[PDB]
Amino acid sequence: PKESDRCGGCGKFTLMSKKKSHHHKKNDFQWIGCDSCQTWYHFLCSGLEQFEYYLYEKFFCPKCVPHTGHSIRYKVVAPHRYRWYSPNEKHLGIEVGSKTWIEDFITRENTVPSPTDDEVCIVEDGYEFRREFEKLGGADNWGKVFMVKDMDGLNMTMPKPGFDLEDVVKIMGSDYEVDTIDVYNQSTYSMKLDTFRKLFRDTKNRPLLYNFLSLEFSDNNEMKEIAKPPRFVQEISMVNRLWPDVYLPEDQRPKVEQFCLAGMAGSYTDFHVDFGGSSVYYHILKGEKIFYIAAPTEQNFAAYQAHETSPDTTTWFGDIANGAVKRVVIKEGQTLLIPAGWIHAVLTPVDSLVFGGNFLHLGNLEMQMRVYHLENAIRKEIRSEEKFYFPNFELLHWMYMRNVLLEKITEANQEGSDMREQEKNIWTASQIMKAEMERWMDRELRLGPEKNAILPTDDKNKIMISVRKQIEIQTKIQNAKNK
Ligand SMILES: O=C(O)CC[C@@H](O)C(=O)O
Ligand SMILES: [Fe+2]
Ligand SMILES: [Zn+2]
Ligand SMILES: [Zn+2]
Prior knowledge:
Layout: E1 31-33, E2 40-42, E3 56-58, H1 65-68, E4 72-73, H2 99-108, E5 120-125, H3 126-135, E6 145-150, H4 165-172, E7 177-182, E8 187-192, H5 193-201, E9 210-212, E10 215-216, H6 223-226, H7 231-236, H8 238-242, E11 259-263, E12 267-272, E13 279-294, H9 298-309, E14 326-331, E15 335-338, E16 343-359, H10 365-381, H11 393-414, H12 419-447, H13 457-479
Parallel strand pairs: 5-6
Antiparallel strand pairs: 1-2, 3-4, 6-15, 7-8, 7-9, 10-11, 11-16, 12-16, 13-14, 13-15, 13-16
Helix pairs in contact: 9-10, 11-12, 11-13, 12-13
The structure holds (2R)-2-hydroxypentanedioic acid, fe (ii) ion and zinc ion (2 copies).
Fe (ii) ion binds at residues 272, 274, 344.
């Protein structure tokens, strides 16, 4: 509540990877007044970091702290509410992920049913993983979750244990800004990596718990060699296929295959499906995670879909999910491999450091589209576009169809090969991807291009047309082995 008077800081008067803090940078230029010297500051100019904007009831500017001591935070009047500072909320009900709800969930969580052998497969090491994965038909048929106790045989480059946050801030830099989840407030704010470091190392005082979204390091030349996807992931990753480690501008590469995650004990991430129906690898370098997961059945998607567009905020999805939710504990040194569509929440019982990544692959093409449809539906239903969705989803597919599939189909045609003999998978994938893209093309006809579409409609039709033709031709080549 300030007048036409000036900010003591500035002296003036009145997306390729996962990022969420950039949305409410509209608080940056709201005002905070120092409680001592009574000078006013733009939040941005106050010395406060984004995550602290809302914390202090009494703010002391950097010029008064020496004699006032530190700013005073609001009293936690409602531990069971996201708005824990608000007295007018003390009487409302326990919200999921609030401090209250978490500590009450920690006592009961382990009464969540273990999963069936059709849902999750636990193996001792990467060599066994490969055998079991293969016995179930490999990547083209990858449908269950795998937990791999020991990473040997997995061919996944990870740092040696003991590598820790300090190493990360060393590499990325002490000033690097990471999007961090204020867990109790179930919102995302930017925080210096060094500040997170500090908060993390202070094991005694933790008014709020912080857990970082996705520090994606694929463009840090040192980091990107330290922690990588299992080789088998690299071999099936659609993005890696189109943008091989260095055609197609790097500024259009979806950047989600190499993330670092750090989380405090008692951290909770609520149920979701990974953007784009993408699959994930996840190695616990330090700590422990408990995943609560549910199969991607049509019914669980319906259930989950209604849980997300429900205004309700106090019901745990697991509790109204007809028992579909299963518990899996992933311990330090262990690795989790999750294929498309799995619904999951995560509890972090213990201070943790994790390396992981998201990817799209042709073997889950159908499920990826399904999830995509789910996201589109949920978006229409609730304007909560703090959400992050798979960067350049459709563009990825246009490039993949053009650069990869179309080329294969055409080659096969030019030599008169029946693709079913040696390339059946590529053939069935092309048809499914094509059908989905026709839908996109039609939608674009009835309602125009999206706000962000990189590919010009022109280039899209000229691709669609080359494809229809090569597919017709191959369809004839196949029908021709008939009598
Ligand atoms: O480890 C958790 O906090 C979340 C992990 C995973 O579900 C995610 O998509 O980031
Ligand atoms: Fe996830
Ligand atoms: Zn200012
Ligand atoms: Zn002051």
